[PDB]
């Protein structure tokens, strides 16, 4: 009677191929069996099949193949084994000679189980540790050597400028400057503190503790000082030795001479991890100190002897690889000499996958672009619809060839008929050598792939798909009797001064003032600054574009206005652009947070971008670089050509600063599998790995480790699925006990923080978590000498399955909010735990000890009789930790953290917060995990929602043990934090708008286009006033909680 007896015939249960991203040690098989048959091919021609062990070294199988070749024919024709080396084909499909013969059979990635013997061809065998680089990069280096494209060959050879220069800078004041590279100081951007931190110091003094180790070494020694927060390490080193050596047998004078000798032989190291205080900064400017201040901790430093630190730092010793009018060009013709409009011949798409029936007709659409468009889109005529389609037409684009701006691009697609796109591609109208393109080109196309209903897609990547098996589309680019080039800077400045002087003598009348004297209007002169302060997505009217464009020379006094100005320029005017080029030449620098906007997808022009790089070169600190390193790396994707200013800028800072270098390496490597960027990023990785010194060997351990964990988890997620956790855990431990695992997963640096060493695995405390993606919870001994003062055991989570890089961004934004708030007075303690995407849906996530979800809290306190959970269980659990004077502070923390997170989750619009999304620490801090879809992707089915809705539970904790908790003064002070915080982020809205814009380069489906970012404009309410936005925030907070949020403020 339920379904009106209607059968579903189509339905069937057996494999419904209906789950309701995803090789290992050999081809097709993850884990090679413990004994295996390995064919050994020799110079004899004899293929003697050995059975060796999975985990056996090449040294072992060699010194056994030596002995068991004495049992086969032609023996005296085999040389001494010490004159031989192995080689085979790998899964990447190359002949990998096997030099480091300590390597085990399972680590070689062999495809087919066999070896071949040969002699050391290329006797410079130390040179053929490009292998290291290839391993590190995740593709072979020789794959670059056989690339035709000169741009690539030119990138590799010319980018060594930066490498060599940067290596010289490292060995300037050595071994100090080497230790600056290796152990750069970890310090905040401001030397002064916010006032709430200061006030935990009794008029600016920290109680420190210095530790020493003199032989027998066995013993260590506290030296507790009480010194100024702003005193440098040099001073703290002194006062520490004063105490050590003070005696009844030293006078004051004889003490000071002992101090002076000992002073300059030591430096300060943080206890329990490889951080170091290596230059003149206030102690509190270093982040460890400022963490210790806030957390309620006494800094534990250590006097490290400079001998024993400079002992650890090895020589980097870079060397250049095998890749080591007056020309045939004759600058043949300047672009501006040419007399015709652009036309481009489209002819024949080789194939397209469309139905003859369903789709009626098809055509190749085209348009010329500069981000946004400089003429009408030129569709081609319909032909041979859905069945071997070829054209042979020229489309005539209304722009005179001299007008084409330096970064102009053909954007094309192929559409259907009721329109939808089939495939797409774009081309740089100028090549990397400033040459305007001519001849025929073969543009292999991309899929749309998802979402993108728009016909053309110019925000996508330039160049052809490196998959040959795609819609190809041949086309001819017009030829002007001779090779064309973009004009020199000499030419453009000359034309600028001309059209500048041509302005000066124009008539009294000119469509009034449609696009244009020194009469400096005073209402207008305030309209510029009003527009200057607007957000990047506040769409500008062409009236304002002219208005701006006309007073261009005035705008130079408000340098901040430039992003608005540049979007106002007509790029299909050679005249306007030439003058803009000359403004940008002299234009004075702007704040790095604005300059970053000028490396997003709307500003392609090399001159504009070179400016942006120069702003960052002067103004952006190494601290603020490593904050914003993610965006800067994703913004390389939008650069036209391989060699450019921004890549040189980043490659240099990566080779300056091993903390940057590390994340600069990982951030490229993680996007490597993505074939669109694959080539740009590899060549860059190749240049970095070649120049970074011994760190390459540290990375190779990190990579080698990750591969093991990827491989282990793959076996768990396929095959060992549908097995009890008890079974899976017997497999997990068996495998980590294996010796190749022990090799690979023990001596290395946590990629989440290379500062923290990972030593021996405590298998005891390693386990496969409950989640279906089978994340591994790993746990290593901290092999530091002072592990006791930080953490005896470092543990982090490895998750193969989820795409981390969304989390990666929201945590980044959270950190940036916390810092805005902190230095603007407001203490709202967020916890942006560490997360790192290291590959296609694979990553690492920091654990946060002594934290549990609200669900777990409620199960401990949850009364044995399973009726209902009480809301007070949280509040009671929190009291049971925090008793006495403690208790009040534990609430203060909760209230502060809750508020901070209330604001951020509303603003970012992250996934709905339920009980297993929110966690509470024993000390009483609240923080969110697993954020999911961030700018409200969940509206695409059917608003402006509050995802963090304060249940009764939280409100109690906020107001202490309470009845009617929304009326308390505790809750008022909470409400005020939200109002001060919400405004604070709003006042820095530009940064977040840009930060998101820069992240359109990544493949994340929550950032497809600028209209996805629009949400963040609504929720911060920038089209309204700040008093309206406040009231909007209060409104929306009132809506979700059902009352509470009706208030007023005294200060405006």
């Amino acid at each position: 009677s339920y379904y009106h007896h209607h059968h579903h015939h189509d339905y069937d249960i057996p494999t419904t191929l209906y789950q309701g991203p995803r090789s290992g040690e050999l081809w097709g098989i993850h884990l090679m069996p413990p004994r295996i048959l390995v064919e050994c091919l020799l110079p004899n021609g004899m293929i003697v099949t050995l059975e060796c062990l999975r985990e056996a070294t090449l040294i072992t199988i060699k010194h056994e193949l030596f002995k068991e070749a004495r049992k086969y024919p032609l023996h005296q024709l085999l040389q001494d084994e010490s004159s031989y080396i192995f080689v085979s084909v790998t899964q990447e499909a190359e002949r990998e000679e096997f030099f480091d013969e300590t390597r085990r059979l399972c680590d070689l990635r062999l495809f087919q189980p066999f070896l071949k013997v040969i002699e050391p061809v290329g006797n410079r065998e130390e040179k053929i540790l490009n292998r290291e680089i290839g391993f590190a990069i995740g593709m072979p280096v020789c794959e670059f050597d056989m690339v035709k494209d000169p741009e690539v060959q030119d990138f590799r050879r010319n980018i060594l400028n930066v490498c060599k220069e940067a290596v010289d800078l490292r060995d300037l004041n050595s071994p100090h400057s080497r230790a600056m590279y290796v152990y750069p100081p970890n310090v905040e951007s401001s030397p002064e503190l916010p006032k709430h931190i200061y006030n935990k110091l009794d008029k600016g003094q920290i109680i420190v503790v210095i530790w020493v180790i003199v032989s027998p070494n066995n013993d260590k020694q506290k030296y507790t000082l009480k010194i100024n927060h702003d005193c440098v390490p040099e001073q703290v080193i002194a006062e520490a030795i004063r105490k050590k050596t003070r005696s009844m047998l030293l006078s004051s004078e004889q003490l000071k001479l002992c101090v002076l000798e000992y002073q300059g032989k030591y430096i300060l190291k943080v206890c329990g991890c490889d951080e170091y205080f290596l230059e003149k900064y206030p102690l509190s400017q270093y982040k460890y100190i400022r963490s210790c201040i806030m957390l309620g901790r006494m800094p534990n430093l250590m006097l490290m002897a400079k001998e024993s630190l400079y002992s650890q730092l090895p020589m980097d010793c870079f060397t250049m690889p095998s890749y080591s009018y007056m020309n045939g060009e004759t600058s043949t013709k300047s672009l501006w000499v040419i007399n015709s409009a652009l036309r481009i011949k489209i002819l024949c798409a080789t194939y397209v996958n469309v139905n003859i029936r369903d789709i009626d007709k098809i055509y190749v659409r085209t348009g010329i672009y500069h981000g946004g468009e400089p003429l009408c889109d030129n569709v081609n005529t319909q032909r041979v619809p859905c069945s071997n389609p070829r054209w042979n037409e020229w489309l005539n684009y209304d722009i005179y060839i001299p007008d084409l701006p330096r970064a102009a691009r053909l954007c094309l697609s192929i559409c259907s008929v009721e329109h939808c796109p089939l495939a797409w591609g774009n081309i740089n109208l100028f090549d990397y050598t400033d040459t305007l393109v001519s001849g025929k080109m073969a543009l292999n196309l991309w899929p749309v792939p998802h979402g993108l209903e728009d016909l053309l897609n110019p925000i996508g990547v330039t160049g052809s798909n490196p998959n040959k098996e795609t819609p190809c589309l041949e086309l001819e680019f017009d030829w002007f009797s001779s090779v064309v080039k973009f004009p020199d800077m000499s030419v453009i400045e000359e034309h600028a001064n001309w059209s500048v002087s041509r302005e000066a003598g124009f008539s009294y009348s000119h469509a009034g003032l449609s696009n244009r004297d020194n009469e400096l209007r005073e209402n207008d002169k305030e309209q510029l600054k009003a527009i200057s302060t607007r957000d990047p997505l506040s769409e500008i009217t062409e009236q304002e574009k002219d208005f701006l464009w006309s007073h261009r020379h005035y705008c130079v006094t408000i340098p901040e206005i430039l992003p608005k100005l540049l979007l106002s320029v007509k790029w299909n005017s050679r005249d306007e652009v030439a003058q803009m080029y000359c403004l940008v030449k002299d234009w004075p620098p702007i704040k790095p947070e604005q300059a970053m906007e000028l490396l997003d997808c709307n500003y392609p022009d090399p001159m504009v971008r070179g400016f942006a790089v120069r702003c960052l070169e002067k103004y952006l600190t190494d601290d603020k670089l490593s904050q914003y390193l993610i965006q800067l790396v994703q913004v390389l994707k939008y650069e036209q050509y391989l060699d450019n200013l921004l890549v040189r800028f980043l490659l240099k800072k990566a080779l300056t600063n091993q903390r940057i270098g590390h994340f600069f390496f990982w951030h490229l490597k993680s996007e490597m599998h993505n074939k669109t960027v694959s080539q740009r990023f590899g060549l860059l990785l190749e240049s970095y790995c070649r120049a970074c010194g011994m760190y390459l060997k540290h990375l190779n351990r990190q990579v080698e480790a990750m591969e093991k964990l990827i491989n282990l988890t793959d076996i768990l997620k396929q095959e060992k699925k549908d097995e009890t956790q008890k079974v899976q855990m017997k497999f997990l431990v068996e495998q980590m006990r294996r010796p190749d695992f022990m090799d690979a997963l023990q001596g290395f640096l946590s990629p989440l923080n290379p500062a923290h060493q990972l030593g021996n695995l405590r298998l005891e405390e390693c386990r496969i978590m409950s989640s279906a993606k089978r994340p591994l919870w790993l746990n290593w001994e901290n092999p530091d000498i002072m592990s006791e003062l930080l953490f005896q055991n470092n543990e982090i989570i490895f998750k193969n399955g989820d795409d981390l890089r969304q989390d990666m961004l929201t945590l980044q934004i959270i950190r940036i909010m916390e810092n805005i708030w902190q230095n603007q007075g407001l203490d709202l303690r967020m916890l942006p735990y560490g997360c790192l995407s290291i590959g296609d849906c694979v990553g690492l996530i920091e654990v946060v000890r002594n934290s549990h979800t609200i669900m777990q809290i409620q199960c401990k306190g949850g009364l044995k009789g399973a009726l209902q959970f009480n809301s007070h269980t949280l509040h009671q659990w929190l009291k049971d930790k925090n008793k006495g004077e403690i208790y009040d502070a534990a609430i203060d923390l909760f209230t502060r953290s809750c508020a901070g997170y209330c604001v951020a989750t509303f603003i970012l619009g992250i996934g709905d917060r339920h009980n297993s999304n929110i966690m509470v620490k024993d000390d009483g801090q609240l923080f969110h995990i697993d954020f999911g879809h961030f700018l409200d992707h969940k509206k695409k089915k059917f608003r402006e929602r509050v995802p963090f809705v304060l249940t009764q539970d939280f409100l109690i904790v906020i107001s202490k043990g309470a009845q009617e908790c929304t009326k308390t003064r505790e809750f008022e002070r909470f409400q005020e934090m939200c109002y001060k915080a919400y405004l604070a982020i709003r006042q820095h809205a530009n940064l977040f708008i840009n930060l998101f814009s820069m992240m359109l380069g990544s493949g994340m489906p929550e950032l497809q286009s600028f209209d996805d970012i629009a949400y963040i404009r609504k929720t911060l309410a920038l089209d309204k006033t700040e008093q309206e936005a406040l009231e909007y925030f209060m409104k929306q907070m009132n809506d979700a909680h059902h009352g509470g949020w009706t208030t007023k403020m005294d200060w405006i």
């Binding site: 084909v89 499909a93 066999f114 789709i359 009721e418 728009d454 769409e539 007509k570």
Partner: protein, 218 residues
């Protein structure tokens, strides 16, 4: 204005003009302020009038009421049926993208696998030719020297080597024809996505028809 930004930009998506609130109003992306009240032709008559006539660098108004294809109650389910079509179509759309993705990565795994095969073979072809140098440099004896203690077992190596190669070339062959059907299956998935696309766009457009007329289920 005669009553009888984010959403204005979103509704302008997929259209090769319209009036909006804030100057006090905005003709729309190419944004035109209505500041340019207080002029000839009371607001609305300036809109009917039209663009080169003032601006150097310069037919389809959008306000269809969408009764084109009367209840309030019954039209409420005409969303609930079209949106279930839309979402079941959407579900099927993005179902095949997983297959489109998985197959394409599976495909490129096969050619890179085939390159390893091809290359592996070239080492085995080179190995049978390695012995015929070094075996028939010592076939000098042929019959004598304790009969055939050498040359019988040399032939066994050569026999396995060649029959091994045999199996490798079979394995590649097998993979190459695996790739072919996969190539055809890939193309076939893309084919049905392109027929679904405009059905899915029209269904999403016609879902907007029954939404915007009316201005729980979903």
């Amino acid at each position: 204005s005669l009553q009888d930004r984010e959403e204005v930009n979103e509704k302008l998506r997929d259209t090769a003009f319209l009036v909006r609130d804030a100057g006090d109003y905005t003709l729309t992306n190419k944004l035109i302020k209505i500041f340019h009240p207080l002029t000839f032709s009371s607001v609305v008559e300036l809109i009917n009038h039209y663009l080169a006539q003032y601006n150097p660098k310069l037919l389809y108004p959008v306000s269809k009421y969408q009764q084109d294809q009367d209840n309030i109650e019954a039209v409420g389910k005409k969303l609930h049926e079209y949106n279930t079509q839309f979402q079941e179509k959407s579900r099927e759309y993005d179902r095949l993208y997983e297959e489109y993705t998985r197959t394409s990565q599976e495909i490129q795994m096969k050619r890179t696998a085939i390159e390893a095969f091809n290359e592996t073979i070239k080492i085995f072809e080179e190995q049978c030719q390695t012995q015929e140098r070094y075996s028939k440099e010592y076939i000098e004896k042929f019959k004598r020297e304790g009969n055939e203690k050498e040359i019988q077992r040399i032939m066994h190596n050569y026999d396995k080597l060649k029959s091994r190669i045999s199996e490798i070339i079979d394995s590649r062959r097998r993979l190459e024809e695996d790739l072919k059907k996969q190539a055809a299956e890939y193309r076939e998935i893309d084919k049905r996505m392109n027929s679904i696309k405009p059905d899915l766009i029209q269904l999403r457009k016609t879902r907007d028809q029954y939404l915007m007329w009316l201005t729980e289920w979903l």
